[PDB]
Amino acid sequence: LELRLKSPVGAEPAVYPWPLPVYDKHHDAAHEIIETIRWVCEEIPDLKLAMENYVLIDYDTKSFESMQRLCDKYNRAIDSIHQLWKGTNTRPSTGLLRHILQQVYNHSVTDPEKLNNYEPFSPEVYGETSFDLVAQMIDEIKMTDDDLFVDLGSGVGQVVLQVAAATNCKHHYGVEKADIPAKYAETMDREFRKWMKWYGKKHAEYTLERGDFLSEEWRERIANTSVIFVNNFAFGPEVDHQLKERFANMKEGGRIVSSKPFAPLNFRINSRNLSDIGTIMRVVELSPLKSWTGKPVSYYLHTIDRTILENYFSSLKNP
Ligand SMILES: CCC#CCN(c1ccc2nccc(N)c2c1)c1c(Cl)cccc1Cl
Numbered sequence: 001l002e003l004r005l006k007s008p009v010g011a012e013p014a015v016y017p018w019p020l021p022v023y024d025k026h027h028d029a030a031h032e033i034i035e036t037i038r039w040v041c042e043e044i045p046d047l048k049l050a051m052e053n054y055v056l057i058d059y060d061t062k063s064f065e066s067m068q069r070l071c072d073k074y075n076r077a078i079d080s081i082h083q084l085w086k087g088t089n090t091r092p093s094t095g096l097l098r099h100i101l102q103q104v105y106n107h108s109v110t111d112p113e114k115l116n117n118y119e120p121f122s123p124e125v126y127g128e129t130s131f132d133l134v135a136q137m138i139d140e141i142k143m144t145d146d147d148l149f150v151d152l153g154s155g156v157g158q159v160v161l162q163v164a165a166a167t168n169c170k171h172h173y174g175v176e177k178a179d180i181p182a183k184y185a186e187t188m189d190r191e192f193r194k195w196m197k198w199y200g201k202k203h204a205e206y207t208l209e210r211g212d213f214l215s216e217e218w219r220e221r222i223a224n225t226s227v228i229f230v231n232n233f234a235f236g237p238e239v240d241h242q243l244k245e246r247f248a249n250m251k252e253g254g255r256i257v258s259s260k261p262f263a264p265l266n267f268r269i270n271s272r273n274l275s276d277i278g279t280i281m282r283v284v285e286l287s288p289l290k291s292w293t294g295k296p297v298s299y300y301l302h303t304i305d306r307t308i309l310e311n312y313f314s315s316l317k318n319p
């Protein structure tokens with residue numbers, strides 16, 4: 001007893017067991033199946049044409065026969081389109097990417113209680129605000145093939161997967177210290193590569209790794225990173241202090257995007273604060289409210305700029 005969805009690009013079929021997995025009180029694999037079919041139809045106009053109308057209206061998610069009929073109608077339409085194409089790698093749209101990431105999470109994080117994450121930043125609620133704010137961040141910072149992206153404390157790797165599907169950075173890295181999210185990130189990685197191949201979608205290279213970003217090995221890695229992403233909301237003074245010492249080795253123009261600023265927004269260099277991180281970085285608050293109708297949220301963009309410090313010394317020598 002199972003349900004199969006044929007890939008629109010001829011990759012291995014998606015196989016679901018019956019009874020279908022339940023994700024939460026209002027979300028299950030049956031809705032995921034329906035939404036996957038709809039996304040493929042939206043993406044492939046010939047498929048929308050070949051498939052029968054009623055199929056996506058008259059369905060019973062609690063009936064094996066009804067769900068099998070729905071999958072069969074989609075599969076037959078896939079076969080017709082493959083026959084049509086017989087007779088003579090793009091990035092996912094934002095909408096498709098939102099669906100893919102949720103689907104990857106649902107097939108990977110089967111026991112969300114294990115994460116022990118009760119914050120708004122939890123992987124469990126990533127789709128609510130984080131996905132949209134990360135999409136806004138990607139459009140604002142505009143990375144190229146010369147960039148290296150690193151998420152410090154990457155959880156199950158959701159930000160890394162989103163950024164790798166959307167940008168052309170040379171490489172995307174996620175580093176996570178905790179055992180449970182790092183173990184789940186290994187499944188997220190496998191499921192993401194599998195689903196992206198199933199849809200026929202391209203993504204940049206990425207690595208999700210277990211590790212401590214405060215280790216000796218990570219000092220040079222942070223120094224050589226052009227874009228750092230970090231959810232530093234819950235960081236204590238020691239981790240915060242140590243991380244600022246790591247940032248102090250980054251190159252000019254290096255960027256840090258975070259949930260809390262590492263330096264005051266109104267930093268004013270003087271003789272008493274020459275040791276503060278504010279002397280070598282610009283800091284701006286980015287708010288989608290400044291066609292956003294979501295939560296009134298913000299993130300912080302830091303840009304390594306040692307001319308702040310240089311101008312202070314040249315101003316002393318040039319009164
Ligand atoms: C950890 C997963 C994530 C994310 C997106 N994100 C933010 C920032 C503030 C928020 N406030 C409230 C609720 C949220 N979901 C918020 C998400 C973020 C960005 Cl864009 C840049 C740098 C750091 C962060 Cl953490």
Ligand SMILES: N[C@@H]1CCCN(c2ncnc3[nH]ccc23)C1
Nearest residue numbers: 153175176177178211212213214
């Ligand atoms: N889940 C973890 C909570 C704390 C932040 N975090 C980290 N990940 C990887 N290296 C780290 N060194 C210090 C903190 C840290 C992720």
